Amino acid sequence: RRLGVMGGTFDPIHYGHLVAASEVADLFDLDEVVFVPSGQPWQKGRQVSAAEHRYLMTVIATASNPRFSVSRVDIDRGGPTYTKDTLADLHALHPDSELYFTTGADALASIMSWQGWEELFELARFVGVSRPGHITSLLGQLAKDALTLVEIPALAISSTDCRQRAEQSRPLWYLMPDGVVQYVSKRRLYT
Amino acid sequence: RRLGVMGGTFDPIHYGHLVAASEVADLFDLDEVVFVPSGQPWQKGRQVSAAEHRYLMTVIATASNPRFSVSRVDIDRGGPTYTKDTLADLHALHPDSELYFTTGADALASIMSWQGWEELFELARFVGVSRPGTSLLGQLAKDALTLVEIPALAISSTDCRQRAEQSRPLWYLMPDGVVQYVSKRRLYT
Ligand SMILES: CC(C)[C@H]1CC[C@H](C)C[C@H]1OC(=O)C[n+]1c(COc2ccccc2)n(C)c2ccccc21
Ligand SMILES: [Cl-]
Ligand SMILES: [Cl-]
Ligand SMILES: [Cl-]
Ligand SMILES: [Cl-]
Numbered sequence: 026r027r028l029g030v031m032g033g034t035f036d037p038i039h040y041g042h043l044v045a046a047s048e049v050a051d052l053f054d055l056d057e058v059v060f061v062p063s064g065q066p067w068q069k070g071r072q073v074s075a076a077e078h079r080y081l082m083t084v085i086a087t088a089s090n091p092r093f094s095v096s097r098v099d100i101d102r103g104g105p106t107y108t109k110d111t112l113a114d115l116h117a118l119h120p121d122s123e124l125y126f127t128t129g130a131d132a133l134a135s136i137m138s139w140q141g142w143e144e145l146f147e148l149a150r151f152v153g154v155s156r157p158g159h160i161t162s163l164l165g166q167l168a169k170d171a172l173t174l175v176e177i178p179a180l181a182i183s184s185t186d187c188r189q190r191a192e193q194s195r196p197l198w199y200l201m202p203d204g205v206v207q208y209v210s211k212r213r214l215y216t
Numbered sequence: 217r218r219l220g221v222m223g224g225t226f227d228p229i230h231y232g233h234l235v236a237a238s239e240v241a242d243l244f245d246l247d248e249v250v251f252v253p254s255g256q257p258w259q260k261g262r263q264v265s266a267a268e269h270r271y272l273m274t275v276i277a278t279a280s281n282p283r284f285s286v287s288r289v290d291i292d293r294g295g296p297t298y299t300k301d302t303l304a305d306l307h308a309l310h311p312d313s314e315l316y317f318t319t320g321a322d323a324l325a326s327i328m329s330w331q332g333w334e335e336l337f338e339l340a341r342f343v344g345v346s347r348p349g350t351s352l353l354g355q356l357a358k359d360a361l362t363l364v365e366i367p368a369l370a371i372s373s374t375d376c377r378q379r380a381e382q383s384r385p386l387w388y389l390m391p392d393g394v395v396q397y398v399s400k401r402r403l404y405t
């Protein structure tokens with residue numbers, strides 16, 4: 026049994042993320058993908074939206090898919106979110122599943138540089154998903170089958186662009202599910 | 217009043233097309249957009265799916281949007297489409313609207329090359345849409361048309377058909393109803 030673990034802040038989630046999870050599930054024959062919204066990033070950058078907003082947008086976006094679910098392990102843990110804690114928690118909850126941790130390739134590079142990965146690679150296989158656009162030699166240096174990079178055209182859609190459109194009152198329709206568009210608007214998330 | 221005319225083969229329609237139409241409508245303050253599935257393209261290539269399938273997928277995809285609708289005028293005319301016929305038909309149906317014709321930059325290049333572009337520019341404002349990344353340059357230089365980049369057009373009909381052929385999932389690249397219509401009609405097997 027194989028379980029995908031889609032980590033991110035999901036601020037907001039959009040169709041790029043959903044396509045990514047669907048394609049990774051297909052490529053690696055995953056039985057389910059669990060979306061795990063981050064609790065509080067250690068990574069330097071923008072202040073993220075309140076955790077319950079990012080959780081609810083992720084539930085709304087994934088509800089209709091019988092093979093997707095959403096986990097609160099990172100939001101409920103307390104303190105900053107580390108990938109190794111996420112995988113430990115999910116390994117305990119799903120003891121017989123091989124874990125496939127999936128996130129944006131850039132984000133994954135930062136995790137590996139800052140946190141290291143010998144312990145991470147013992148816990149899960151890793152998949153970095155990248156927007157359309159020497160690194161192979163580097164990938165050959167890594168443990169066999171430990172890390173795969175996958176290009177997803179739909180990741181031309183970005184959370185940054187979605188937030189900027191919302192701030193500028195430009196339409197979000199068809200970049201993300203209807204329910205997420207309306208949740209963003211009626212809770213006034215990105216003004 | 218301003219009306220967008222979104223021409224395409226829509227084989228299949230996908231979220232890239234819907235984002236593009238929505239973005240053009242916002243940029244140009246269009247009151248509505250009419251999608252017009254075309255006949256067989258002028259350019260030599262694959263035979264597109266039967267017109268009824270492409271029309272139904274476009275209706276399914278746009279039904280929920282109050283500002284979108286679908287027109288049969290090009291598929292009922294028969295043959296490859298002259299854009300001046302499309303614009304004459306839509307002008308008669310919306311005679312007080314200024315028309316904005318939008319299509320893929322590649323289709324627009326074929327229009328400029330094989331159809332009478334001088335007559336065409338009297339009839340509508342032309343907008344080409346493309347994903348980020350030559351006679352068309354002469355008209356752009358004169359501001360006889362405008363090109364708009366749409367990131368979601370990284371999603372392409374070619375990739376959607378290849379995925380269907382290989383039994384790979386189409387979820388979230390296009391509305392659920394289109395995914396299921398493609399599957400249960402076996403369109404790209
Ligand atoms: C840890 C690095 C050396 C290494 C991990 C395995 C992947 C093949 C990534 C590699 O990173 C890079 O190559 C460059 N890089 C990126 C760019 O991240 C990617 C990711 C995938 C493909 C290309 C670039 N970001 C965001 C970094 C942050 C800190 C240090 C180096 C970083
Ligand atoms: Cl993103
Ligand atoms: Cl609510
Ligand atoms: Cl009118
Ligand atoms: Cl002509």
Ligand SMILES: [Cl-]
Pocket residue numbers: none
């Ligand atoms: Cl049917």
Ligand code: NA
Pocket residue numbers: 356359360361362363
């Ligand atoms: Na122009």
